[PDB]
Scaffold this motif. Structure first.
Motif, PDB file in Angstrom:
ATOM      1  N   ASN A   1      37.267 -70.617  58.197  1.00 17.71           N
ATOM      2  CA  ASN A   1      37.365 -71.359  56.951  1.00 17.71           C
ATOM      3  C   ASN A   1      36.329 -70.797  55.992  1.00 17.71           C
ATOM      4  N   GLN A   2      36.623 -70.894  54.698  1.00 19.20           N
ATOM      5  CA  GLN A   2      35.702 -70.385  53.692  1.00 19.20           C
ATOM      6  C   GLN A   2      34.462 -71.266  53.616  1.00 19.20           C
ATOM      7  N   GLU A   3      33.310 -70.671  53.890  1.00 19.16           N
ATOM      8  CA  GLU A   3      32.048 -71.388  54.024  1.00 19.16           C
ATOM      9  C   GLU A   3      30.941 -70.342  54.039  1.00 19.16           C
ATOM     10  N   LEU A   4      29.704 -70.804  54.190  1.00 22.25           N
ATOM     11  CA  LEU A   4      28.573 -69.919  54.410  1.00 22.25           C
ATOM     12  C   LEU A   4      27.751 -70.458  55.566  1.00 22.25           C
ATOM     13  N   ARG A   5      27.244 -69.558  56.403  1.00 22.95           N
ATOM     14  CA  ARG A   5      26.389 -69.960  57.511  1.00 22.95           C
ATOM     15  C   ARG A   5      25.673 -68.727  58.044  1.00 22.95           C
ATOM     16  N   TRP A   6      24.664 -68.970  58.877  1.00 19.43           N
ATOM     17  CA  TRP A   6      23.841 -67.892  59.400  1.00 19.43           C
ATOM     18  C   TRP A   6      24.362 -67.368  60.732  1.00 19.43           C
TER      19      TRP A   6
ATOM     20  N   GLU B   1      34.309 -66.266  69.040  1.00 17.90           N
ATOM     21  CA  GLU B   1      35.707 -66.014  69.377  1.00 17.90           C
ATOM     22  C   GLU B   1      36.584 -67.191  68.969  1.00 17.90           C
ATOM     23  N   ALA B   2      36.091 -68.414  69.169  1.00 18.63           N
ATOM     24  CA  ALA B   2      36.751 -69.588  68.611  1.00 18.63           C
ATOM     25  C   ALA B   2      36.691 -69.577  67.093  1.00 18.63           C
ATOM     26  N   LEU B   3      35.610 -69.039  66.530  1.00 19.63           N
ATOM     27  CA  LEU B   3      35.484 -68.956  65.081  1.00 19.63           C
ATOM     28  C   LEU B   3      36.406 -67.882  64.516  1.00 19.63           C
ATOM     29  N   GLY B   4      36.565 -66.769  65.230  1.00 14.60           N
ATOM     30  CA  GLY B   4      37.510 -65.735  64.856  1.00 14.60           C
ATOM     31  C   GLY B   4      36.880 -64.467  64.333  1.00 14.60           C
ATOM     32  N   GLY B   5      35.598 -64.498  63.987  1.00 15.87           N
ATOM     33  CA  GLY B   5      34.930 -63.347  63.419  1.00 15.87           C
ATOM     34  C   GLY B   5      34.399 -63.624  62.030  1.00 15.87           C
ATOM     35  N   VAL B   6      33.448 -62.809  61.583  1.00 12.51           N
ATOM     36  CA  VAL B   6      32.750 -63.045  60.331  1.00 12.51           C
ATOM     37  C   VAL B   6      32.853 -61.801  59.462  1.00 12.51           C
ATOM     38  N   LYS B   7      32.567 -61.988  58.179  1.00  6.39           N
ATOM     39  CA  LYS B   7      32.545 -60.903  57.213  1.00  6.39           C
ATOM     40  C   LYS B   7      31.455 -61.196  56.196  1.00  6.39           C
ATOM     41  N   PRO B   8      30.896 -60.169  55.561  1.00 11.72           N
ATOM     42  CA  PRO B   8      29.765 -60.394  54.653  1.00 11.72           C
ATOM     43  C   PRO B   8      30.163 -61.165  53.404  1.00 11.72           C
ATOM     44  N   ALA B   9      29.285 -62.079  52.995  1.00 15.19           N
ATOM     45  CA  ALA B   9      29.494 -62.896  51.812  1.00 15.19           C
ATOM     46  C   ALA B   9      28.165 -63.069  51.095  1.00 15.19           C
ATOM     47  N   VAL B  10      28.243 -63.462  49.830  1.00 16.15           N
ATOM     48  CA  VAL B  10      27.079 -63.517  48.959  1.00 16.15           C
ATOM     49  C   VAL B  10      26.883 -64.959  48.513  1.00 16.15           C
ATOM     50  N   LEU B  11      25.629 -65.400  48.481  1.00 13.93           N
ATOM     51  CA  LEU B  11      25.314 -66.678  47.861  1.00 13.93           C
ATOM     52  C   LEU B  11      25.529 -66.599  46.355  1.00 13.93           C
ATOM     53  N   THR B  12      26.013 -67.694  45.781  1.00 16.06           N
ATOM     54  CA  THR B  12      26.108 -67.875  44.341  1.00 16.06           C
ATOM     55  C   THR B  12      25.263 -69.065  43.910  1.00 16.06           C
ATOM     56  N   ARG B  13      25.198 -69.265  42.593  1.00 14.47           N
ATOM     57  CA  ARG B  13      24.463 -70.403  42.059  1.00 14.47           C
ATOM     58  C   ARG B  13      25.154 -71.714  42.405  1.00 14.47           C
ATOM     59  N   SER B  14      26.484 -71.698  42.509  1.00  8.84           N
ATOM     60  CA  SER B  14      27.219 -72.923  42.804  1.00  8.84           C
ATOM     61  C   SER B  14      26.940 -73.404  44.222  1.00  8.84           C
ATOM     62  N   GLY B  15      27.090 -72.520  45.207  1.00 11.23           N
ATOM     63  CA  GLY B  15      26.957 -72.916  46.596  1.00 11.23           C
ATOM     64  C   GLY B  15      28.176 -72.552  47.416  1.00 11.23           C
TER      65      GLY B  15
END
Lengths: 814, 74, 91
Positions: free
Chosen positions: A16-21, A114-128
């Protein structure tokens, strides 16, 4: 002493579209990284890039440093560090409301992915909300090379008393410039982002907007490798201000070594950069109170009795468990299947010839038994288990001469061989006692190349002679007789034998050449490609055996072995020979004069075995474990004598069979000879198979004799590769414009190399003519007479630099 | 932080390269040279101080350098 | 075909009647030999083994040389039958 370093970045999930470490790599004395699979690559040395270190210096010159702050949780750390970035005006106060929630996010490891499916690089914005980067991205170098059990080893390597460090790297579009925070805690603290039970002391924060020549993963790698060094870590443990860290960073950069990209990279010129790095190491540890961790000849004259034997035993026998274990690859099985036939066929040929030559005093079964026993014992107790023992040609010639002499003088034959064997035993004991094998040092590359080239040439010539004999036995006529009985042996010509034999030979060679080249291609997946390429010879043999099996009415000569373990001629012979006399008693003068042929047999066996061991174990063929000379000589000659006691023949090391065995057990790199599998199981299995060959009548009776000619030609062509005289002969035709870049081309003029090659070819021709002359037993002597030629006569014609560059003792170094 | 001999050595290593000297022949302003220097420095590898055995450390770099040199010539 | 016995009072004036001993394998041998020689000369054309002029001259004549070699090879064999080229007698 040894610490654990973790690096996590702020990216987005494919779920899902989100941000996390999510973490990207780990550092315990080495770098370990993971790819898209969630699996960690093998640890390796960490390699820096210019921009990472440079921008780390640039941001570090203006970084806030907080030393020994008393916190144990993550939210108080976040609050205090963001107050610190507010304090030194590193970020605007209207950003904190974003950055706090930038920090308070989940920190998951690979097992969740593996349950998550994999990650790809994303950038923080001012909105969040996550967003894609504007500047383009490239595939990482470390994941492509290294990524394309582990945690137990991680907890094993890490000492139980240690503290960890963490770095949090991310991209945020609402910032102006990259900012850095560096905090060392008052006391060790457990943090809920790290699942490992180790506590944390140091912490990094590297943030910034996107800019050219900045890769935040590379910057994090630079920070982690900065943290991993012993002296800088000790300084940070004792750091009290910022300028101390600055001076330690400058000392870190000063002892760094950078190498630029080049035109044609190589390893040999690169090995000269060892000592300067050591001196940088020493100068780096010049500044540290701590100290760094890391700071014989097989032939030689020793002042002790029997020194060589003990030296070789102590050198070789510690490798026995590795020699046992290294045999579990399938390439060993393929090499076994190949060398079994390669060693069985000449055994049968020489057995039949010797049985028909000496009125069946010695035949096929004795030779088979001798090959089996002398292979088993040599593979079990040998120093170099890659040698292949078997009957030769000069031994057959000597047997012929001795039988003619005993027929003429009126004595027995199988009895005199017993005394000859006794003298051989005594002589080899006397020679090994005085370590007289150091003379192998004087045999240069000249004689080795001449001998190997001559042997391979004779092999090919005899193979073609066999084929021409087959053509001579069944000519091409217009009519044949067809009430012919073919029970004992084919009487008269046959319609389709001569051409079918040629077809089978060409087919075996052609298929072998098709699979050897496919092995080196890039056409199938690497695993299956190498597996299919290593089994080329047995696959071709099986295909052609089936092809011949389908044809019904045409006759082709097959392989045939004796019926049982019986003596050749049971009328006059027994399993044990009485030395005093078999039928009539043996004279005394022959007992005392049998020493003369023993010396010649010893010279032959010694020369052949030692030259074979020289050719096989050259430094160029990546042979790690040591090879022994005295032990092999003692074993071979003593066992040959003991076999001569029972009336069975003595054996010697074979050149072509051993070279083929060694070439078959070689794993090559994508070409460079990566390594060579040395073990004792292959020879033992080959010997056991040769011994049991008499019990394999139904399977062996269906293998046509013409298929093995293709394999023999393939063997003769393959054994011709490493010869350098062959290369210098090939250069006799090319114009000097296409000559290679080896030293012997550049250092000496062309018409001098041509003179050298001509001299060597004249030597070859003289050896051949002497071999054809009925004075063939004088072949070894003449051969050793080529050694003085190299020591005296050539320095009268050439110059010293030409002679050193041409006749080079080592292949790589010239 | 200045040693003139090593700076000259760096200049010589610049001049000994193929692509950089090709750009110097095709150069017409300072911008092309700066761009070519950026492209040259983008394809180097730096070695930190490591206590590993030096021959094994030096031999581990080879395919990394091969991939970098394949990338540079593109 | 490949049989155990053949008849040898066969009249082959219009065409070979019945099987013959060595035709089938000799034909295959000639084809494989001609193909191998053509490929080897084609590869020698691109090699660097002789002076360039003579090398290119020899490489350009690969097919006729192989044809001549195999024609001579067949000419030396006397008793074996192989199908030949035949053209009408006149216009």
């Amino acid at each position: 002493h040894k610490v654990y370093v973790e690096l996590q970045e702020l990216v987005m999930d494919e779920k899902n579209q989100e941000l996390r470490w999510m973490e990207a790599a780990r550092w315990v004395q080495l770098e370990e990284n993971l790819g898209e699979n969630g699996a960690w690559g093998r640890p390796h040395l960490s390699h820096l890039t210019f921009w990472s270190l440079l921008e780390l210096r640039r941001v570090f010159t203006k970084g806030t440093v907080l030393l020994d702050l008393q916190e144990t949780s993550l939210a108080g750390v976040a609050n205090q560090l963001l107050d610190r970035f507010i304090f030194e005006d590193q970020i605007r106060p209207q950003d904190r409301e974003e950055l706090l929630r930038a920090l308070l996010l989940k920190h998951s490891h690979a097992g969740e992915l593996e349950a998550l499916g994999g990650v790809k690089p994303a950038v923080l914005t001012r909105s969040g909300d996550p967003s894609q980067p504007l500047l383009p991205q490239h595939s990482s170098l470390e994941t492509q090379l290294f990524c394309e059990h582990s945690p137990s080893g991680i907890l094993e390597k890490i000492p139980p008393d240690s503290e960890a460090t963490l770095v949090l790297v991310g991209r945020a579009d609402f910032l102006e410039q990259p900012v850095l925070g560096f905090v060392r805690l008052q006391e060790a603290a457990e943090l809920e982002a790290v699942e490992l039970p180790v506590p944390i002391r140091f912490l990094f924060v590297l943030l910034g907007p996107e800019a050219p020549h900045i890769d935040y993963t590379q910057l994090g790698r630079a920070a982690a490798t900065l943290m991993s060094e012993r002296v800088f870590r000790i300084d940070a443990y004792m750091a009290q201000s910022r300028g101390e860290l600055l001076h330690s960073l400058e000392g870190f950069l000063d002892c760094s070594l950078v190498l630029p990209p080049t035109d044609a990279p190589s390893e040999q010129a690169l090995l000269s950069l060892v000592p300067v790095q050591r001196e940088l190491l020493r100068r780096r540890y010049q500044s540290s109170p701590a100290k760094p961790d890391s700071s014989d000849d097989p032939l030689q004259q020793t002042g002790q009795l029997f020194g060589g034997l003990v030296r070789d035993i102590r050198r070789r026998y510690p490798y026995y468990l590795s020699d046992i274990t290294d045999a579990f690859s399938p390439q060993v099985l393929a090499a076994v299947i190949f060398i079994y036939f390669a060693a069985l066929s000449p055994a049968i040929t020489f057995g039949g010839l010797l049985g028909e030559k000496t009125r069946n005093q010695m035949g096929v079964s004795e030779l088979l038994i001798s090959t089996a026993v002398q292979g088993i014992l040599f593979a079990l107790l040998g120093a170099q288990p890659l040698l292949v023992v078997g009957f030769s040609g000069p031994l057959l010639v000597f047997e012929e001469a001795f039988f003619s002499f005993c027929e003429t003088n009126g004595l027995e034959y199988i009895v005199g061989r017993v005394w000859i064997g006794f003298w051989l035993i005594l002589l080899v004991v006397l020679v090994v006692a005085f370590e007289g094998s150091f003379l192998v040092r004087f045999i240069s590359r000249y004689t080795q190349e001449i001998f190997s080239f001559l042997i391979s040439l004779i092999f090919i010539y005899e193979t073609f002679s066999k084929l021409i004999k087959i053509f001579q036995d069944h000519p091409l006529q217009k009519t044949y007789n067809y009430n012919v009985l073919m029970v004992p042996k084919p009487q008269g010509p046959l319609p389709n034998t001569a051409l079918l034999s040629l077809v089978l030979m060409a087919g075996t060679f052609f298929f072998a050449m098709m699979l050897r080249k496919f092995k080196n291609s890039s056409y199938f997946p690497g695993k299956l490609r190498r597996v299919i390429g290593d089994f080329g010879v047995p696959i071709s043999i099986l295909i052609m055996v089936l092809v011949d099996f389908f044809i019904q009415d045409t006759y082709t000569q097959k392989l045939s072995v004796p019926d049982g373990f019986k003596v050749s001629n049971s009328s006059a012979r027994g399993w044990v020979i009485h030395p005093l006399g078999l039928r009539s008693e043996f004279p005394i003068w022959m007992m005392f004069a049998s020493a003369l042929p023993a010396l010649l047999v010893f010279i032959l066996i010694f020369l052949e075995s030692q030259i074979t061991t020289l050719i096989v174990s050259k430094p160029e063929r990546k042979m790690v474990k040591g090879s022994g000379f005295h032990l092999d000589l003692l074993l071979v000659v003593g066992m040959g004598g003991v076999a001569a006691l029972f009336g069975m023949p003595w054996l010697s090391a074979t050149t072509v069979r051993s070279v083929t065995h060694a070439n078959a057990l070689t794993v090559m790199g994508k070409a460079q000879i990566q390594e060579v599998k040395e073990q004792r199981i292959s020879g033992l299995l080959v010997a056991v198979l040769v011994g049991l060959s008499i019990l394999m009548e139904p399977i062996l009776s269906r293998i046509p004799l013409a298929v093995l000619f293709g394999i023999f030609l393939y063997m003769g062509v393959t054994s011709l590769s490493g010869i350098q005289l062959f290369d210098r002969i090939l250069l006799l035709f090319k114009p000097p414009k296409y000559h290679p870049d080896v030293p012997y081309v550049k250092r000496v003029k062309t018409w001098r190399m041509h003179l050298f090659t001509g001299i060597q070819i004249i030597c070859l021709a003289v050896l051949w003519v002497v071999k054809s002359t009925p004075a063939s037993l004088a072949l070894p002597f003449v051969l050793i007479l080529t050694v003085p030629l190299r020591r005296v006569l050539l320095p009268l014609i050439f110059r010293n630099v030409e002679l050193q560059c041409l006749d080079a003792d080592d292949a790589k170094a010239t």
